[PDB]
Amino acid sequence: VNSFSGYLKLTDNVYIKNADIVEEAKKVKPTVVVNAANVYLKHGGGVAGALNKATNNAMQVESDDYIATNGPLKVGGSCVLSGHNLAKHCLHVVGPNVNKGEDIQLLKSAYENFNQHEVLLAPLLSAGIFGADPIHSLRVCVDTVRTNVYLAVFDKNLYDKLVSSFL
């Protein structure tokens, strides 16, 4: 038993809600919140900009030190950093950004990072301003992640569309 509330059950291990991931994180304080990052960990907009703003820019400061030491992530890759005031840990996961011309096939690799964590609060990878088909992303999530994932979808119209089209 865990502390997530009002999530619609999609499968044996995937739950979904129409909610702001920042607000869910501040309420639940999950072990792991997933950030929809880029390879430079430049947290400008979307999930990343919103999470970082909620940490008062501490996420960005930590991320800049990470990049200075380690260099950029790979598309499809991830790193574990602090969750600051939002969670114990933040798993920064890089899904392909279609608006940058990145390989959509890399979405499955991106979701595989979730399997290293027993429970996660996450956004829908590569959706929104990342430019991929969100129905496809939810499908890849359900077909790739085996650990317990709680998906927080910001856009109300998007959430309704995702639920009504889920096979």
Ligand X SMILES: O=C(O)C[C@H](NC(=O)c1ncnc2[nH]ccc12)c1ccccn1
Q: Which residues bind ligand X (CB under 6 A)?
A: 20-22, 36, 46-47, 50, 123-125, 127-130, 153-155, 158
Nearer to ligand X, 67 or 129 (CB): 129
Nearer to ligand X, 81 or 123 (CB): 123
113 CB-near residues (< 8 Å, 6+ apart): 77, 78, 91, 93
Nearer to ligand X, 69 or 164 (CB): 164
Nearest distance from C-beta of residue 116 to ligand X, angstroms: 19
Nearest distance from C-beta of residue 19 to ligand X, angstroms: 9
Closest CA to 31 of 12, 56, 58, 4: 4
Nearer to ligand X, 129 or 135 (CB): 129
d(C-alpha 73, C-alpha 143), whole Å: 24
Instruction: Name the residue whose CB lies closest to ligand X.
Output: 128
Token readout for 95 is: 């899904």
Nearest distance from C-beta of residue 25 to ligand X, angstroms: 10
Give SS3 for 119.
strand
Nearer to ligand X, 65 or 100 (CB): 100
Nearest distance from C-beta of residue 115 to ligand X, angstroms: 19
> Are 161 and 130 contacting, i.e. CB atoms less than 8 angstroms apart?
no
Indicate the DSSP class of residue 101: T
Nearest distance from C-beta of residue 46 to ligand X, angstroms: 3
d(C-alpha 51, C-alpha 64), whole Å: 15
d(C-alpha 119, C-alpha 149), whole Å: 6
